[PDB]
């Protein structure tokens, strides 16, 4: 359900970091076991990542901010567990 | 047969060796999908000769391009023939005419 990504590159810019962020998001869905926020109407990871880019929910900034938050919360949970 | 031709398809077929051109005129004695027997006329036997010409056709023989090379008789039993007439057409030939 995606044939033109012009509205996606206009959202991200430079047409290059969009590929990297979409690849990271698709890897998060596929091997990372993440939950696709947008509805999944029988599609695989890459187009869910592209549509999430389109809707503006995910970009580079939100992605690494969420990654840092997950890292710090899991570190806190681990240190609580060992203590 | 090609509906529109230039007229030399007969010459091309005859000069090429795909066809089975009779060497001596006569009357067909035994026609078959494999062999043709020609009983030559009274003028054309050498002394002390049977006067029987045996033409052996080539059926489904491989070519240099992995294509079929088949020979099919065109004459009928009892049909008189003369020297130079076609007896069995080869590939892409119909009644002694090139048919690509």
């Amino acid at each position: 359900a995606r044939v033109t990504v012009q509205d996606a590159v206009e959202k991200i810019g430079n047409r290059f970091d969009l590929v990297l962020v979409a690849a990271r998001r698709a890897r998060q869905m596929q091997v990372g076991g993440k939950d696709p926020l947008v509805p999944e109407e029988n599609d695989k990871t890459t187009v869910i990542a592209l549509r999430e880019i389109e809707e503006g929910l995910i970009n580079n900034q939100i992605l690494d901010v969420r990654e840092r938050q997950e890292q710090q919360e899991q570190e806190a949970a681990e240190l609580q567990a060992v203590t | 047969k090609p509906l529109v031709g230039t007229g030399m398809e007969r010459a091309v077929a005859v000069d090429s060796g795909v066809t089975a051109v009779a060497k001596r005129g006569g009357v067909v004695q035994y026609v078959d999908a494999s062999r043709i027997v020609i009983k030559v006329n009274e003028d054309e036997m050498y002394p002390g000769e049977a006067g029987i010409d045996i033409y052996n056709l080539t059926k489904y023989t491989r070519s240099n391009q992995n294509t079929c090379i088949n020979q099919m008789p065109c004459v009928s039993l009892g049909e008189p023939v003369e020297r130079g007439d076609v007896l069995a057409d080869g590939p892409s030939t119909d009644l002694g005419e090139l048919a690509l």
């Binding site: - | 078959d32 999908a33 059926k59 039993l77």
Partner: protein, 230 residues
């Protein structure tokens, strides 16, 4: 507006194959529509019977030649493909043909069980050039629809394939030419009613009225899904 109902008025059987049928009365719009639909259905989905598998007495493979016949086995299969046959009752028929002596071996020489009927006895099958040579063959006739290539029949490999059982492509369609020409009809005093004339050229294995009825039944069955909808 109380649409009138077309009826099959008369059938003109000029020859054993060529036929002309007339349908009337018909309204202005319905004529071309019915003509086109009937033409397509008759040309495509008309059932028939055809020869598929053959077995020669002493032929190992269809790329060979048999002594005494002036035609190759491939030519024999091609001639068998054009055979016209009607079964009237079962799906599988086995026919045996045995001939001896010099002469044109035709479809009339094929032994008939009586239920099976040959439409064209004049159809020549082969030619025996030598008197001592004899030809014995067994052919299989099956009822089907449309065109079935030999490769599709080969796909059934449950019983493997005995050597010498040659396979021939099946042309189950009994019709070869279909045309229609609607024209003006004189019924009552209305000048708008039209008569549809359908000219068909078949192989003689099917009746015109039966073919028309089958096509109409198929169209009605297809439109039954349209009628109900959701």
């Amino acid at each position: 507006t109380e649409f009138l109902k077309p009826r099959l008025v008369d059938i003109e059987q000029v020859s054993s194959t060529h036929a002309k049928v007339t349908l009337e009365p018909l309204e202005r719009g319905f004529g071309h529509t019915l003509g086109n639909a009937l033409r397509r259905i008759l040309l495509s989905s008309m059932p028939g019977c055809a020869v598929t598998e053959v077995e020669i007495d002493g032929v190992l493979h269809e790329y060979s030649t048999k002594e005494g016949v002036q035609e190759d086995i491939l030519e024999i299969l091609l001639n068998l493909k054009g055979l016209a046959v009607r079964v009237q009752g079962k799906d599988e028929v086995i026919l045996t043909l045995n001939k001896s002596g010099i002469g044109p071996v035709t479809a009339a020489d094929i032994t008939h069980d009586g239920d099976v009927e040959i439409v064209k006895p004049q159809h020549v099958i082969c030619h025996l050039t030598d008197e001592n040579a004899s030809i014995s063959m067994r052919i299989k006739v099956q009822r089907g629809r449309g065109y079935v290539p030999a490769s599709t029949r080969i796909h059934s490999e449950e019983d493997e394939r005995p050597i010498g059982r040659l396979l021939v492509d099946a042309c189950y369609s009994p019709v070869e030419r279909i045309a229609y020409n609607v024209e003006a009809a004189r019924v009552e005093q209305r000048t708008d009613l039209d008569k549809l004339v359908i000219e068909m050229e078949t192989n003689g294995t099917i009746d015109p009225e039966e073919a028309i009825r089958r096509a109409a039944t198929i169209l009605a069955e297809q439109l039954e899904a349209f009628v109900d909808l959701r």
